[PDB]
Amino acid sequence: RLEPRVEERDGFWVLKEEFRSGINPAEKVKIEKDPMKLFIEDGISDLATLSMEEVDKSKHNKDDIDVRLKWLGLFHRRKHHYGRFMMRLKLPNGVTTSEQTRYLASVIKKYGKDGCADVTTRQNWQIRGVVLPDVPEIIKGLESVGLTSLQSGMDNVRNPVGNPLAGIDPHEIVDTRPFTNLISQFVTANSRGNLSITNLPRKWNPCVIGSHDLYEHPHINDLAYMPATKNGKFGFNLLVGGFFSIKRCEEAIPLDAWVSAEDVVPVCKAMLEAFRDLGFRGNRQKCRMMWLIDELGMEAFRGEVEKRMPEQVLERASSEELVQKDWERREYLGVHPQKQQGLSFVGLHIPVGRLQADEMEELARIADVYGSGELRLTVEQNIIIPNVENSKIDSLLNEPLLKERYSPEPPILMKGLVACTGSQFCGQAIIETKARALKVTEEVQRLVSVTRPVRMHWTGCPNSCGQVQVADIGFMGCMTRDENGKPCEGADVFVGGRIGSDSHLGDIYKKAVPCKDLVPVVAEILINQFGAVPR
Ligand code: SRM
Ligand code: SF4
């Protein structure tokens, strides 16, 4: 045991025969045909042929559409958008150009009532509505503007998140951009696909911290790079194993490793390989990297990463940390000064992250006209317009879709509002979230007033995409039954989760609250635990 269970064969990575025992349905799909063959052997061109009738006629085509295709970031919404797809990108740091968002808006347009977009909770774009016939043209389209959507989906490395203010931030510990990009470019082998790394046992979330506020939520990632100097030289201490699941939630923990700026990619490479090689591949809810870790114990696991890297030395964690523990999270919504003299950024609302095609164009145009032609997406499903001259602020704050839809200064509960895709499009969802979230917040601001910023997170199912455990107040979809037995959408309410340097995970606080009784419960928590007032 601790002998690598996957080897290279004819260019692709595959689980050896003798380690094939308990393996789950996803592991059987991967074996039957490496999903990357859809992109590498252009299997994708043949997929754009099939009508949906033909696809569902055979078990192999139905795996491709529903599973394999996730490696090309294409997610079939079988239950809710049959024959249409949600497409997930690769966007290190949340940085997107106005050409990108424009190009995205144009792909969206083509579906009218059936296209929209979303900022995800890893500051990523999701596009909605696509159909197979369009994919080959959309991949060319995304490549021609900087994006790839490669490996965004199953057992790959997910969007590397960084500080949303990377490179414009007045109090910035390290510009995070190079590192998230370095990682993104590494994993994706420059949009060409890194096969050594697409046969993991499970998803894997990386992040890189550059802000004292810890906007990058290091505690919630499989690998979290934490700024600390070692010998004059700058670098990161490694936090490891953080994750949410149906069955388990674990906060990331020190690996006790320091790594220099140059060694960032190397460790990530080494650690992905340790995972790929050694991770469990049976029951799927025991497959995220943390399980491997407690199975071997920390040291033995460090040993495993250590021995996997260039010189086979992994330096120990340094005591010289750069993030300042006693620190209060800055608001980013609104007008804020940059570190560049005479420039400000403007954080914009984005109700629940949802955007339409017409509105995406306007942001893009506003970025061009006021800023540097770019935008910063953020983990609270909002976007910041960076680099505007202070002269232009006034006019900018006077623009139609800033007054109307995407406010720089929304009401206070909206400011920290986050919600997952929900049952509007997501096959997995127990409740509808995005609309329900705006309705419940609405009625809550009506009934109480709060001064403290408060973070509410809706998630539609225990997968916790919406990160209920990090929220002040959280909402996990469940179904409930009336005293008459009538099925009503409802949510578990989580209280007490904490963000930043003194992070904590929230606890179920009242179980199975039905959707009609939801507002009272929230109000009563607001007044009792967040100094809110009636009226
Ligand atoms: C878009 C997003 C929700 C959102 O509205 O923002 C998302 C979308 C999906 N998540 Fe997620 N997850 C999203 C953040 C998360 C997070 C938060 C994070 O990464 O910081 C987590 C927890 C972190 C973690 O992994 O521990 C998360 C943990 C999951 C899991 C649980 C993994 C597990 O071991 O149980 C699933 C189900 C799975 O993978 O087995 C899941 C499954 C899904 C699927 C693919 C479900 C499905 O089959 O369709 C959702 C796609 C729904 C759709 O059509 O939009 N999603 N999901 C967020 C992803 C943005 C991105 O670029 O990746
Ligand atoms: S939390 Fe559940 S309902 Fe929401 S996007 Fe994730 S899997 Fe879907």
Name the DSSP class of 204: B
Same domain, 115 and 15: yes
- 173 close to ligand 1 (CB < 6 Angstrom): no
Range of the domain at 498: 411-535
Q: Is 79 marked active-site?
A: no
CA 406 to chain centre: 21
Is the separation of the CB atoms in 239 and 253 below 8 Å? yes
The continuous run of DSSP H or E covering 258 comes out as: strand 253-260
In this structure, which residue's CA is closest to atom 6 in ligand 2? Answer: 465
Is the separation of the CB atoms in 360 and 105 below 8 Å? yes
Same domain, 251 and 221: yes
**In what order do the strands lie in the sheet containing 343-348?**
95-97, 374-378, 382-389, 343-348, 334-337
Is the separation of the CB atoms in 213 and 329 below 8 Å? yes
> How far is Cα 473 from Cα 469, in angstroms, rounded to an integer?
9
Both tokens assigned to 129? 């509505």
Same domain, 402 and 416: no
Method: X-ray
> How far is Cα 331 from Cα 235, in angstroms, rounded to an integer?
27
Any known ligand binding at 287?
no
Same domain, 281 and 340: no
Is the separation of the CB atoms in 440 and 519 below 8 Å? yes
Both tokens assigned to 474? 């959280």
Ligand 2 center to residue 466 CA distance, Å? 7
Surface-to-core class of residue 27, CB atoms within 10 Å of its CB (0-12 exposed, 13-18 middle, 19+ buried): buried
Annotated resolution, angstroms: 2.8
Same domain, 404 and 526: no
Which 3 state secondary structure label does DSSP give 161? strand
Both tokens assigned to 60? 């192999």
Q: Is 515 marked active-site?
A: no
* Domain boundary residue, one of 284, 306, 331: 331
Ligand 1 center to residue 355 CA distance, Å? 19
In this structure, which residue's CA is closest to atom 1 in ligand 2? Answer: 465
Ligand 2 center to residue 420 CA distance, Å? 6
> How far is Cα 494 from Cα 507, in angstroms, rounded to an integer?
5
Of these residues, 5, 70, 88, 455, which one is catalytic? Answer: 88
Q: Given phi > 0 = left and psi -120 to 50 = alpha, else beta, which region is 472?
A: alpha
Testing ligand 2's pocket by substitution, the residue of 465, 476, 492, 494 carrying the most ligand atoms inside 8 A of its CB is 465
Strands (E), 45-177: 74-76, 85-88, 95-97, 117-119, 125-130
Is the separation of the CB atoms in 13 and 284 below 8 Å? no
Q: Is 466 marked active-site?
A: yes
> How far is Cα 90 from Cα 67, in angstroms, rounded to an integer?
18
CA-nearest of 108, 302, 268 to 188 is: 268
Specify the CATH number for the domain of residue 528.
3.30.413.10
- 428 close to ligand 2 (CB < 6 Angstrom): yes
In this structure, which residue's CA is closest to atom 56 in ligand 1? Answer: 465
Same domain, 306 and 345: no
CA–CA distances in Å: residue 173 to residues 163, 214, 364, 386, 390:
10, 11, 29, 18, 24
**Which amino acid type is present at position 1?**
R
Same domain, 156 and 277: yes
CA–CA distances in Å: residue 330 to residues 68, 170, 242, 335:
41, 11, 24, 12
The continuous run of DSSP H or E covering 78 comes out as: helix 78-81
CA-nearest of 151, 147, 158 to 122 is: 158
Is the separation of the CB atoms in 125 and 165 below 8 Å? no
Q: Is 57 marked active-site?
A: no
Complete DSSP assignment for 474-532: EEEEEEEE-TT--EEEEEEEEE--B-STT-B--EEEEEEEETTTHHHHHHHHHHHHS--
* Domain boundary residue, one of 286, 309, 331: 331
CA-nearest of 320, 377, 335 to 160 is: 377
Same domain, 44 and 87: yes
Same domain, 61 and 113: yes
Q: What is the largest CA-CA distance in the chain?
A: 69
Q: How many CB atoms lie within 10 A of CB 55?
A: 19
The total domain count for the chain is 3
Q: Is 282 marked active-site?
A: no
CA-nearest of 384, 379, 389, 378 to 402 is: 384
Give the CA angle between residues 351, 101, 386 to the nearest 5°: 75
* Domain boundary residue, one of 277, 302, 331: 331
Same domain, 38 and 7: yes
**In what order do the strands lie in the sheet containing 117-119?**
74-76, 85-88, 125-130, 117-119, 354-355
For 485, residues 6+ apart whose C-beta sits below 8 A from its C-beta are none
Q: Is 465 marked active-site?
A: yes
- 149 close to ligand 2 (CB < 6 Angstrom): no
Specify the CATH number for the domain of residue 90.
3.90.480.20
Same domain, 282 and 423: no
Strand partners, 378: 382
Give the CA angle between residues 276, 281, 284 to the nearest 5°: 120
> How far is Cα 312 from Cα 315, in angstroms, rounded to an integer?
10
- Angle of the 135-143 helix axis to the 98-109 helix axis, nearest 10: 170
CA-nearest of 213, 211, 183 to 197 is: 183
Ligand 1 center to residue 417 CA distance, Å? 17
Strand partners, 86: 75, 128
Any known ligand binding at 465?
yes
Ligand 1 center to residue 243 CA distance, Å? 11
> How far is Cα 437 from Cα 352, in angstroms, rounded to an integer?
8
Testing ligand 2's pocket by substitution, the residue of 78, 81, 118, 426 carrying the most ligand atoms inside 8 A of its CB is 426
> How far is Cα 420 from Cα 354, in angstroms, rounded to an integer?
10
Same domain, 18 and 62: yes
Which 3 state secondary structure label does DSSP give 444? helix
> How far is Cα 19 from Cα 6, in angstroms, rounded to an integer?
9
